[PDB]
Design an enzyme around this catalytic site. Sequence first.
Site, PDB file in Angstrom:
ATOM      1  N   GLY A   1       1.161  -1.632   0.021  1.00 22.22           N
ATOM      2  CA  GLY A   1       0.273  -0.205   0.344  1.00 22.22           C
ATOM      3  C   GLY A   1       0.943   1.669  -0.474  1.00 22.22           C
ATOM      4  N   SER A   2       1.919   1.413   0.671  1.00 20.75           N
ATOM      5  CA  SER A   2       2.588   2.094   0.888  1.00 20.75           C
ATOM      6  C   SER A   2       3.157   2.498  -0.462  1.00 20.75           C
ATOM      7  CB  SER A   2       3.988   2.078   1.837  1.00 20.75           C
ATOM      8  OG  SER A   2       3.505   1.817   3.418  1.00 20.75           O
TER       9      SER A   2
ATOM     10  N   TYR B   1      -3.875   6.997   6.469  1.00 18.13           N
ATOM     11  CA  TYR B   1      -2.959   6.420   6.814  1.00 18.13           C
ATOM     12  C   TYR B   1      -3.374   5.893   4.904  1.00 18.13           C
ATOM     13  CZ  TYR B   1       0.448   3.021   8.531  1.00 18.13           C
ATOM     14  OH  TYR B   1       1.517   1.798   8.751  1.00 18.13           O
TER      15      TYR B   1
ATOM     16  N   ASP C   1      -8.490   4.895  -1.483  1.00 22.98           N
ATOM     17  CA  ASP C   1      -7.232   3.989  -1.741  1.00 22.98           C
ATOM     18  C   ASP C   1      -8.175   2.626  -0.531  1.00 22.98           C
ATOM     19  OD1 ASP C   1      -5.369   2.790   0.429  1.00 22.98           O
ATOM     20  OD2 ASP C   1      -4.585   3.979   1.063  1.00 22.98           O
ATOM     21  N   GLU C   2      -8.341   1.885  -1.771  1.00 19.21           N
ATOM     22  CA  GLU C   2      -8.981   0.540  -1.192  1.00 19.21           C
ATOM     23  C   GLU C   2      -8.175  -0.486  -0.298  1.00 19.21           C
ATOM     24  OE1 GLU C   2     -12.517  -0.124  -1.902  1.00 19.21           O
ATOM     25  OE2 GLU C   2     -12.152   1.944  -2.985  1.00 19.21           O
ATOM     26  N   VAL C   3      -6.166   0.772  -0.511  1.00 18.39           N
ATOM     27  CA  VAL C   3      -6.100  -0.785   0.145  1.00 18.39           C
ATOM     28  C   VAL C   3      -6.772  -2.068   1.543  1.00 18.39           C
ATOM     29  CG1 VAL C   3      -3.692  -1.251   0.967  1.00 18.39           C
ATOM     30  CG2 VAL C   3      -3.488   0.402  -0.491  1.00 18.39           C
ATOM     31  N   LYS C   4      -7.360  -1.229   2.899  1.00 19.28           N
ATOM     32  CA  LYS C   4      -7.942  -1.771   3.555  1.00 19.28           C
ATOM     33  C   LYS C   4      -8.843  -2.414   3.393  1.00 19.28           C
ATOM     34  CE  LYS C   4      -7.117  -2.382   7.947  1.00 19.28           C
ATOM     35  NZ  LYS C   4      -6.177  -3.270   8.811  1.00 19.28           N
TER      36      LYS C   4
ATOM     37  N   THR D   1      12.438  -3.312  -9.208  1.00 23.38           N
ATOM     38  CA  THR D   1      13.003  -4.749 -10.294  1.00 23.38           C
ATOM     39  C   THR D   1      11.692  -5.718  -9.507  1.00 23.38           C
ATOM     40  OG1 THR D   1      15.147  -3.936 -10.248  1.00 23.38           O
ATOM     41  CG2 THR D   1      14.323  -6.630 -10.482  1.00 23.38           C
TER      42      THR D   1
HETATM   43  C1  LIG Z   1      17.914  -2.199  -7.813  1.00 26.67           C
HETATM   44  C2  LIG Z   1      18.636  -2.013  -6.640  1.00 26.67           C
HETATM   45  C3  LIG Z   1      18.308  -0.953  -6.270  1.00 26.67           C
HETATM   46  C4  LIG Z   1      16.476  -0.824  -5.570  1.00 26.67           C
HETATM   47  O1  LIG Z   1      15.689  -2.222  -6.156  1.00 26.67           O
HETATM   48  P1  LIG Z   1      14.121  -2.065  -6.267  1.00 26.67           P
HETATM   49  O2  LIG Z   1      14.194  -3.612  -5.862  1.00 26.67           O
HETATM   50  O3  LIG Z   1      14.266  -1.691  -7.649  1.00 26.67           O
HETATM   51  O4  LIG Z   1      13.496  -1.581  -5.775  1.00 26.67           O
HETATM   52  C5  LIG Z   1      19.047   0.357  -4.875  1.00 26.67           C
HETATM   53  N1  LIG Z   1      20.489  -0.270  -4.318  1.00 26.67           N
HETATM   54  C6  LIG Z   1      21.150  -0.963  -5.196  1.00 26.67           C
HETATM   55  C7  LIG Z   1      22.329  -1.190  -5.349  1.00 26.67           C
HETATM   56  C8  LIG Z   1      20.774  -1.394  -7.118  1.00 26.67           C
HETATM   57  O5  LIG Z   1      21.069  -1.714  -7.807  1.00 26.67           O
HETATM   58  C1  LIG Z   2      -2.549  -0.771   5.554  1.00 24.52           C
HETATM   59  C2  LIG Z   2      -2.488   0.532   4.295  1.00 24.52           C
HETATM   60  C3  LIG Z   2      -1.803   1.274   3.401  1.00 24.52           C
HETATM   61  C4  LIG Z   2      -0.136   0.842   3.209  1.00 24.52           C
HETATM   62  O1  LIG Z   2      -0.158  -0.396   3.251  1.00 24.52           O
HETATM   63  P1  LIG Z   2       1.256  -1.252   3.571  1.00 24.52           P
HETATM   64  O2  LIG Z   2       1.505  -2.573   2.848  1.00 24.52           O
HETATM   65  O3  LIG Z   2       1.173  -1.187   4.817  1.00 24.52           O
HETATM   66  O4  LIG Z   2       2.720  -0.816   2.914  1.00 24.52           O
HETATM   67  C5  LIG Z   2      -1.949   2.149   2.618  1.00 24.52           C
HETATM   68  N1  LIG Z   2      -3.229   2.804   3.024  1.00 24.52           N
HETATM   69  C6  LIG Z   2      -3.859   1.927   3.109  1.00 24.52           C
HETATM   70  C7  LIG Z   2      -5.381   2.523   3.410  1.00 24.52           C
HETATM   71  C8  LIG Z   2      -3.707   1.546   4.223  1.00 24.52           C
HETATM   72  O5  LIG Z   2      -4.781   0.686   5.391  1.00 24.52           O
END
Ligand SMILES: *Cc1c(COP(=O)(O)O)cnc(C)c1O
Ligand SMILES: *Cc1c(COP(=O)(O)O)cnc(C)c1O
Lengths: 434, 435
Positions: free
Chosen positions: B110-111, B137, B236-239, B293
């Site tokens: 979600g973040s 949140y 935000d439908e995350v929750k 990635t």
């Molecule tokens: C790819 C990479 C990241 C970011 O990783 P993600 O999984 O793409 O977010 C950070 N630091 C280094 C040195 C990388 O090669």
């Molecule tokens: C929990 C939540 C997030 C963030 O999810 P994470 O996977 O914990 O980063 C975002 N928005 C809402 C409404 C949430 O409840």
Amino acid sequence: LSLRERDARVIAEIGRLRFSPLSLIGGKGNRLIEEGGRSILDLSGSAGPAALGYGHPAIVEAVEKSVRDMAGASLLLYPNEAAVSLAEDLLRITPGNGERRVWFGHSGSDANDCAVRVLTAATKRSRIISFIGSYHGNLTGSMGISGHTAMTHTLPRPGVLLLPYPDPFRPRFSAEAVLELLDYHFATSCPPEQVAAVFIEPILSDGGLVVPPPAFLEALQDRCRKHGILVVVDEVKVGLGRTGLMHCFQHEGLEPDMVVFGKGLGGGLPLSAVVGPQWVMDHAPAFVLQTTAGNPVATAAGRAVLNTIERQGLAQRSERVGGIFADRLRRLSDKHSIIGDVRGRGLAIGVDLVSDRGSREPAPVTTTAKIIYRGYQLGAAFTYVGLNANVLEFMPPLTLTEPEIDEAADIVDQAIGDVLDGKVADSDVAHFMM
Amino acid sequence: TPLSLRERDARVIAEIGRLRFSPLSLIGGKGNRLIEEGGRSILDLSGSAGPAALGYGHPAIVEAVEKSVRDMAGASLLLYPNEAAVSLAEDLLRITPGNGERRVWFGHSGSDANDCAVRVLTAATKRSRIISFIGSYHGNLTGSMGISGHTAMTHTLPRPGVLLLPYPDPFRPRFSAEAVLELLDYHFATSCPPEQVAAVFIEPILSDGGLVVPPPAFLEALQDRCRKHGILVVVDEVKVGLGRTGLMHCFQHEGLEPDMVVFGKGLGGGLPLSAVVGPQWVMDHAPAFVLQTTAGNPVATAAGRAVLNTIERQGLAQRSERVGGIFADRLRRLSDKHSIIGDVRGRGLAIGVDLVSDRGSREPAPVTTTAKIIYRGYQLGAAFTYVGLNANVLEFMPPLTLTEPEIDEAADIVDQAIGDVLDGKVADSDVAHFM
Ligand SMILES: *Cc1c(COP(=O)(O)O)cnc(C)c1O
Ligand SMILES: *Cc1c(COP(=O)(O)O)cnc(C)c1O
């Protein structure tokens, strides 16, 4: 109708970094299966995640066992056996002193975001030292401390000091000149007592697989450490056996305060980690939360990655087999004058394309992109990187075999020669350029 | 195990990554139950906060995960399209109402999805200002926490250009719907010109803020006030997304037609997966703009397809309205015995119980009482949590597969836990460590 055409219609451009038309329906070992059934040799490792290739039994068993008997789905809520044992594993294989703890996340980006957020809060210092060309992530916090040309649409975090990463192939700036520049910043506009941390890639990845000059990073560390600046090593790209030792920083004599892990840690599942001193990592409860971080499926996969690397000695093997691959690519340089350098460590290998060996003028990005595309047509998957978009990147699975190196080398050989003889058209690669 | 998993966790896991409500430490899971070390089987009313939408070991998710990890179509959507991820994107477009060209980005959380949303909305609109709610949140990474209003993240200043408004709360009605709209109209006429506002971020039930369902028609009126000035409307439908509230999307209760929807938590079925569905002109703003990635990897996206498919096939939206109604009503009737139960609110299987020290004033129960209720719940065989700006709302987010016998077992455990705590039968030292 084609997977590639479907992707075009539903996938957002903001999440694309596509080097060729390769669109996938499966994988096995070190090969990836294109739609239609064509088997491609994967020299990309999907940029690092696929440490053990695809369908590797140790990862498969670990992921099978965990998803069938799932010990919750949130480390924040509930300790689970896999994530706790993985943390134990990471502390065991990473040298360090004092009390240390482990935080888990999904990606290199979020792990560096965590690092930045907790370091600035534990120190209440706001300045960060990092390198021009450094790539620490593409989320707001980790992008903000990165120096790579690709994120210059957005201003850096205020108080970031960006230094040149000393480059033995294009030595505009010697190790000594960069340290002097740092020293001068410390004595003037960036007092070291207001600096939270220095961030170090032990090989500069997207900046062009630049192995720094010997002794420079140990000297950097010691300069920062005299002032109680915390030393953070990003091992996301070149970590976990790929360079011939378990940690790339062990080549460089470093004793970091914090290590950031990602990509290949997950074995193809999302998994990142931050290992640091307990005083930083216990800064406050509920300070850096993501719901499914440290979930038992991804962490179980990570345990299998580490266990395979240790039990099969894949660090030593990456040194030997990477030496073979590296030497095959060096020999291509007697054939193809565009190969200006072959560098890296173990199975992290970059090949620097030049339009002139004298000046070391980088080859144009069009040529570099066409070699990739041609390599794809000939049956290998790879990419390019570098501040001048001219370094071919090979990050194959650590399970790469000696017959696959022969195949890889022949494909690269042919793709270079073809592209230089004008085989591939501008409109073929226009789709994969920005 | 003389060295307990709990103790091993204390030695090696970072406190920054902890939000622990009880000693529960896990070795497995089955159906809607979680297995504690030592073997005790606990009824999961937490759903691990939302991810476990189909519970644990669910065969559809097990099958999708097995097929993908065995025959893995790469591990990076940014490098390589794969069938699972392209098909999931097609699924999310099909199940989410919307007009014109739209596209899907994938992430892990979600973040990171809300960080994506804020980065791409500001860049594509060329507007810098954001409307959010006090107590909202949207995540715990720099960009997503920056637009959040919750008290847990006041250790860090918000993103510049964020307008934070009260969320109208029927149970503690300091601010009416009309008052909040008036306040926004005033900001628009003075210091927050609405043509400088990229987007408004809307939780359709305010989650960590206290499982607050807004007053009817409020969110639709908010949408219309913003949309009138080209402000994009983000839900935000995350929750509370994906069938939990009795309809596929919680915003469908509220008359909303968002420009952008953010998904997470339960989308992955216990694997890390998030998504952003948005219009093409935003989502295709530039190549390589928000990259991670392993995002859109074939394993996590396959799990998501299994989640969506099960929810549509087994009618879990319709079921959650019915079963959540039964559960909610059991909980309400407990207020006859326990006066601390001031409110039971929510939709479907997103249920909050607001604990109060005084029924007249609605003063929140002290957090030590609320923590004791969770701890005693845990000893009686149920796992749950609390939320809210006052740390006093019991949260029930069970798997959508919760059975009717499990609803009775739940209600009984909650009843017994509240009673045991009020009768002074739970020690202070037992909850000390979880606060
Ligand atoms: C790819 C990479 C990241 C970011 O990783 P993600 O999984 O793409 O977010 C950070 N630091 C280094 C040195 C990388 O090669
Ligand atoms: C929990 C939540 C997030 C963030 O999810 P994470 O996977 O914990 O980063 C975002 N928005 C809402 C409404 C949430 O409840």
